[model samples]
Target: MEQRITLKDYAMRFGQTKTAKDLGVYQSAINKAIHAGRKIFLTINADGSVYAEEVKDGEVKPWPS
Candidate 1:
């Protein structure tokens, strides 16, 4: 299963710098993901941790399982 969120909303809430810090990734990566126009996938664990992945292709699968 997967959930989707817009880059604008995400940046509004968490900001790119903080997300990069938390995710252990570069800010450029976050910028690319934001401008890519693909919905970002957020995977949350039971422990309240987050894992984020961006859709590489321009299209997003209708059903992600």
Candidate 2:
């Protein structure tokens, strides 16, 4: 199963630099994820790994909009 969270919340929980390092990606990639959409979603897997993508319509929850 996947846990959905906003990019902002993910950043709050784990700094972009650390997340990038954990994901073996460049910090610029994390920054670019935020610019890809009005609202970004981070899918956290059970293995403690995460990936970012644009939020789809109607998928909004009680997150900070």
Candidate 3:
């Protein structure tokens, strides 16, 4: 079965706790995503379900895990 991924889990990927305030903290979130993971580079978005970008070939693309 597939495990459900809540925003809380998503927040954890950014080294943050699950809180409503997390929605307002994307810069820190992306910074965490960058440093915590081995992505090398990242960019954040103002949209949903597609919030992360990784740099590849000198271009920005969706982070594919």
Candidate 4:
């Protein structure tokens, strides 16, 4: 018995609503990409094997709009 972990699997595992609870992201973050024919681009080998994505708000928040 071995606990083999894979980045793809682990990310998706956490894609579950419960798992994303700790990641500060929602399940939709991963779900959206999957629906868009893309997967969340994870930097698996960077930052001590921590995976992350550079997400923008798609636009900047206006200070006093």
Candidate 5:
């Protein structure tokens, strides 16, 4: 099993007892995905999907993970 922060942690950070409750899932399940790094930071949509959004803007643009 993967060892990482629990989804309840994020739920508290986001101030929601049901962060992904809209999707009908509980804490540990969410942690599994996060532990795998399947979910990303700002680059990911609130819907829990990943995307390659612009990280930096300049003459030399860089892609963010």
Candidate 6:
């Protein structure tokens, strides 16, 4: 089954640790972003590579740099 990912998933993928230390922003920021409708998407491609991006203002941009 495909994994359903969210901002927490995105944050974790962006190297957030148990605390807010890693990403320089608090964990709550990601939680809020997820709840506030910030779009974070992770897709499994046929080639086994992951396709991920964040949707902002109808523009699709890459996630995690």
Best by TM-score: 1
lDDT string for model 6 (6-44, tens) is 555755666444324533456666566667776867655
Indicate which candidate wins on lDDT. 2
Per-residue lDDT of model 5, residues 1-65, tens digit only: 32333333544566333545533455565565556554323233455642222223333221222
lDDT of 1: 0.63
Q: Where is model 6 more than 4 Å wrong at Cα?
A: 1-4, 8-25, 42-52, 62-65
lDDT of 4: 0.44
Question: Which residue window of length 10 is worst by lDDT in model 1?
Answer: 56-65
In the predicted model 1, the residue pairs found to clash are none
lDDT of 6 at 65: 51
Point out where model 2 deviates above 4 Å. Answer: 29-37, 56-65
Per-residue lDDT over 1-65 for candidate 3, one digit per residue giving the tens place of the 0 to 100 score: 22334333455575453322434444565445646653433233454422334556777565443
TM-score for all predictions?
0.58, 0.57, 0.28, 0.36, 0.32, 0.39
Lowest summed lDDT across 10 adjacent residues in model 5 is found at 54-63
lDDT of 2 at 17: 86
Q: Which ranges in model 1 have alpha carbons more than 4 Å from their true place? A: 1-7, 55-65
What TM-score does model 3 achieve against the real structure?
0.28
Error of 1 at 24 (Å): 1.5
Clashes of each: 0, 0, 0, 0, 0, 0
Sort order, TM-score high to low? 1, 2, 6, 4, 5, 3
Better of 3 and 6 by lDDT: 6
In model 6, how large is the Cα lDDT of residue 47?
63
